[PDB]
Symmetry: C5
Subunit: 94 residues, 5 copies
């Protein structure tokens, strides 16, 4: 089992080399709070333009299935969350 809480108020580096296998990210879940603003999580692989991975809507869509693979070769990964609420990534190691 694998999980990471990405906080909103600062872009967050993640290093897949710290995991003993390939990371399967299979879900994003909205963290606690009262904010009704959309929460978007973006991903940049070293210094490339960020790509939006999903978009959660408080009281409508508070989780969504993903199917992403991060390995050693994804040098530094940078996760950025828009909005006032954390996004919980979950999945498993291969």
């Amino acid at each position: 089992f694998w999980g990471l809480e990405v906080k909103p108020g600062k872009p967050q580096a993640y290093n897949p080399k710290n995991e003993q296998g390939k990371i399967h990210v299979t879900q994003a879940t909205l963290g606690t709070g009262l904010s009704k603003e959309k929460s978007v999580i973006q991903c940049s692989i070293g210094d490339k333009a960020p790509i939006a991975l999903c978009s959660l809507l408080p009281n409508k869509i508070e989780c969504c299935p993903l199917n992403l693979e991060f390995d050693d070769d994804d040098e530094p990964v940078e996760f950025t969350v828009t909005g006032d609420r954390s996004i919980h990534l979950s999945g498993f190691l291969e």
Copy 2:
């Protein structure tokens, strides 16, 4: 086939298992039901969030291993969450 009803309130201990769905249990509560997972001593991670009368099930893709470690499922709200999937 594999399935587990996680009851709300008191954290539920568990321990290859493919978890592929969460479904909202019976009850009248309109409050969100969130299921979290905490490994051993680690901070719990939210696995999904179900909304009565809007989203009452969601697809998952989780793997828990043969070794069987210390996993704790915690459900927020007044309603059980039915995990389903299979074993290979």
Copy 3:
């Protein structure tokens, strides 16, 4: 290798000796605005469909079955075999 199974509401339903991948529940025909839940046993909930909101959902599922559906509408299971 298509596969389909309309579970009607009311009394449950058996299964065929020979592997089945169920990958979708779809809400059957009807006017009922009631929640339709489908369940399995070996009695666990597989999914929950809401008329005029969520009328299908993706599944990933693989000795006695018995399917039972809650609600006024049937649920169409679909997928394939391996």
Copy 4:
């Protein structure tokens, strides 16, 4: 190996998997253009058998849904039937 098929509403539409060079993985249904707010259901009947609903799309609520279906040679004639006034775009890939 991208694969896609637009199923038009009304008259049932026959599909022959023998025309594809591999097994067909259908993974998405997407609602076609149109102003109709009526639900769009796509059904599948293989042999002469009874049709099975594959999904149900709701204009301005749920206009696509993930699928995981496999069609091969053995699915003799497949008949797709769409309810409503809007086409359904099936997409996926071929397995060689």
Copy 5:
């Protein structure tokens, strides 16, 4: 092996899978920034073939959706076309 592509609206956008070191698994579409409430549809054409809708995102209702598509050296120029005023972010992974 993370993979991502922002498809901009309006002018169709050519994509070449031969430029990637393995097979492309597209597994999500996410709605780009913007204030437009209009539907965003992404379509795909492989060479000369009529475009097929891959999904349909609804601002403030459905702003991402799971996909399961495979692009290989084939298709050559998979032309992606986005309806609406907002980019669509495709994400997924490479299979080596």
